[model samples]
Target: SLQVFRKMLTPRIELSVWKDDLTTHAVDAVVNAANEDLLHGGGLALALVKAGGFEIQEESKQFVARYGKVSAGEIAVTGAGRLPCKQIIHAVGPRWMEWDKQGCTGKLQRAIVSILNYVIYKNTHIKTVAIPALSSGIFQFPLNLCTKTIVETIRVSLQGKPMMSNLKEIHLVSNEDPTVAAFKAASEFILGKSE
Candidate 1:
């Protein structure tokens, strides 16, 4: 287990879990835990759109109009608007209320994997993407499960199995302590203490 965890770390792919404002990250991109409608309902979406300005919503609206309903576990990309990054990867994760009975583990995994893979395969210019713990807010996914799914998804995604390419950094950002702690612990467990 320890060896497997250690092997997950790579020089090109740096994994970090941090407690900070996601908007403060000057990375290549920031991910939004968006809804199917792609509206800035609240939580991470509100913070992102508020800082990034209305252009983000306008662009997202355009994307919604073109694509119709973004399915759960699917992702869409757009310019960062006035934000500090190059792009915004909107990922629609499963709602915990529905997932409680239907089981959202795979949906959460696919959302993370889909976004990461999207940047890897399509948006090659993007190198670093900061992400919030998906579905940890109003959707109310348990922090432990959310963190585990996120960490493991990134871990498996970057395992040099040709699953992902070009992407270099995955920064898991959170404002809350419990969410931060869960990600921190998961990071340590998946990437080992040296990371």
Candidate 2:
């Protein structure tokens, strides 16, 4: 149980941030912040597998073996195994240090966009997604940039257009206090108070 903060982008769509365990998130999908090779050895990936079971890990291996190492800003989909959701969206986000000289912001935004695009356009059955504060944990991405970019990117995508993407809700959840606070500040700064 945790406090939830949110703002409605539209009547059909809303974005919220909270401090909670994402593995227990009851939604259409829970996004795993994963490595390029889809390994769940540590960090959020490990936690997800611990809850979701090895089926996710097994499918992860198969996906990488078949498609090769995924690029930053790209995403792969797999079954949720034993988790609450129907599927898991494994997001391959950029490691901030490696891409610092190359503008990690673009890569981060692309990763965010890919997830929304997949759910809204590619996988129409997915109406809700639980996203993490990508790159902010072990990836060492700047917290401010990571949080702001994610919120802002999502904000722009859901507004200014009459698009029907089927996706209705996005829950940004983080386990740690600092990250959760970062999401709080970002959401408030970008979206203000919820309706």
Candidate 3:
């Protein structure tokens, strides 16, 4: 994995952009851009499941079985199985073209907040987290807007009370060059030491 951008938000917290595979990231937690059903059918979700093993999908099945389907603004967790990370935050993001475009923005930002909340799980000392661009894939979210909103929301969260969430680092990552480059551009403008 290659780190292309970094923002030292505080003494103990940082945000970074990585050109890497989310499935192989050796972080404490990874965010899966999941649907409401938690099905590992396509996109990044399926890649994670394919690498993490069949139990990943099985756990997702059980999670849904016990708790029911997740909503657009909400998230669920499942064990990573054989994956490098300890757990996966199955964040259910809204499909942009499915409904009101303006309304999806709220859910998109809310989903980011929920991912951060779960990444800093109360049960574990999760210090490192990684997530993809989110909603910009099959969900049809505008690329630059998605990245900008993500950067803005994270800055707000980490600067407010989220800095005390016992975290060390968080990353926005993707294997694709264009995606990582977009993340870097957004981070440079949003999280950098700019006036």
Candidate 4:
């Protein structure tokens, strides 16, 4: 007797946008827009520490001590502490307020790519990951640019990567109206171009 082989459906990355608090998101992991020193000073970083507990900061300090300064486009993973997630993937994005427009765009793209690549390859247990509007806060990056870069990076990086199977969902989270709208627009744009 011959048995029919059924093709197992593998999970691919599904992109979505959310307007909510990153600390409250129910996912496997949440990405933190961090600084080079990994300090939870202000903006999303401060909010994450407040919700995730001081242990996150302490762990970040230790991580910095061991690895030194986290350069732009670099990532450092830590426990989520009290937050509603398993891991906190900290990505050090560039400050667009200080750099040339084109240079800042490059840096932003690199940061997004670096973090997404790390999560897709290194963390196989993460089924869903929530990423905030990176570099659009105190870093003062243009909202549209950041949104476009993030969506495009996700689209481009996941192309032929077999490791992306573990990632079932990728959520782009933001609280502001314009930021959320920008992300939606970017998603639409990417979808149109791809199709």
Candidate 5:
């Protein structure tokens, strides 16, 4: 099937149960599907702020208002002054748009790019990163579609470039433990992992 062919480049899918907040063992940074204002608002942002501590809110606010907005495929960064991670990659993927299109897909690609760019530009002292489902929340994007887009984005961005080793683990972090199995399986299939 052509769908099977898509797996050659991108492979992974996982579900997160807690729609609000989550706590992983550790990561250099956990991505936030944050608002343009970057306040401790509803959905994932609220959960991260509450679990990671309120100081994250303070740090996020420092740059978001001065620079953030829901511009489809764009991203912003914030200091993880209080969270266990080193930084928060606040990726504002396009919201309230059509069901499927290149624009929507582009936003997903841009989200991945935004994170990589931030890591390269920041030169921080961390290596691990936790990525949440980008359009799975109030954005109401289809789940399978989100999974495909995310995996493709990561694979394309992390393609045979010289600096792949410099980057750390890209975890599909989910509060749902069982979801990890499905995510890993699907991702492996998509990325051409025979196992």
Candidate 6:
């Protein structure tokens, strides 16, 4: 795992479970835990828009209108258009409150799965992406559980034979610094490296 981390073109896969804010993040694309509306709602969406500028919301609106309703476990990709990022992944994470069942685990996995697949399919030139802790906020999902699931999903995604040649670095950015430390600690435990 140390060798793998070293060999990765990007050194650190920044991880943090944070609240809504963007002064700390400056990634190519900061994912939005968006609603089906794709509107810049409370958590990640609002923060990203606040930091990256208003263009994100304008671009996201088109996708939301087209899809009509983004299912909680589903995802959509769009150009950041005017935002700093080359792209914006409007991830409609599982909405258990609306559905009456807990689907954060499955949604988290699905979100990662869908985005990676899309990147591969496009053969685009993107390398790094930032992800918030999905379903841990208003979704009322447990933070530790969500973190573990995200780490496990990313581990599998990057290690699977098919993906070895795909992703360079998956930066899990958080608005909160503690979440950042947690991600770093978890990565060391999982990948056997601190730097």
Point to the candidate with the largest TM-score: 2
Q: Which candidate gets the maximum lDDT versus the true structure? A: 2
Off by over 4 Å in 6: 1-24, 96-102, 160-166
lDDT of 4 by residue, 1-195 (tens): 111111112235567777877878888888899999999999999999999899999999999999899988788999999999999999888898554887787877887887777666776777888887789989999898898888887777774455535778777888677887888788777744211
CA lDDT scores, all candidates in order: 0.80, 0.88, 0.85, 0.80, 0.61, 0.62
lDDT string, candidate 6, 1-195, tens digits: 011122232233333333324434455665778887887768767876776677778777777677677887677777664455777778777754535434557877887777666554563566656677777777666666666667777667654343433445566656566555655556556656544
Q: Which model, 1 or 5, shows the larger TM-score?
A: 1
Q: Would you estimate the TM-scores of all the predictions?
A: 0.89, 0.95, 0.93, 0.88, 0.76, 0.76
What CA root-mean-square deviation does each model show from the true structure?
A: 4.2, 1.5, 2.0, 7.5, 6.2, 4.8
Task: Give the per-residue lDDT of model 1 (tens digit) for 45-88.
Answer: 98998998988999999999998978889998888888889899
**Could you tell me which 10 consecutive residues in candidate 2 have the lowest summed lDDT?**
96-105
Task: Check candidate 6 and list the clashing pairs.
Answer: 16-179, 16-180, 17-179, 18-176
lDDT of 2 by residue, 71-113 (tens): 9999999999999899999998888885363478888899999
Clash counts per candidate, in order, are 0, 0, 0, 0, 4, 4
Give the poorly placed runs of model 3, Cα more than 4 Å off.
Answer: 160-162, 193-195
lDDT of 1 at 85: 94
Quick one: ranking by lDDT, best first? 2, 3, 1, 4, 6, 5
Q: Model 3, 54: alpha-carbon shift in Å?
A: 0.7
Candidate with better TM-score, 2 vs 4: 2
TM-score of 1: 0.89
User: How close to the true structure is residue 6 of candidate 5, measured as C-alpha lDDT?
Assistant: 19
Of candidates 6 and 5, the better by lDDT? 6
lDDT of 6: 0.62
Please give the distance, in angstroms, between residue 51's alpha carbon in candidate 4 and its true position after superposition.
0.6
Model 1 stretches astray by more than 4 angstroms: 1-8, 98-102, 160-164
lDDT, candidate 5, 1-195, per-residue tens? 001111222122222222213454466777888766766687778877776788888877767667655465666666665566777778786664665567787787788788766664565454656676676777766556676677667766654444533355566655544334444554764565532
Off by over 4 Å in 2: 98-102
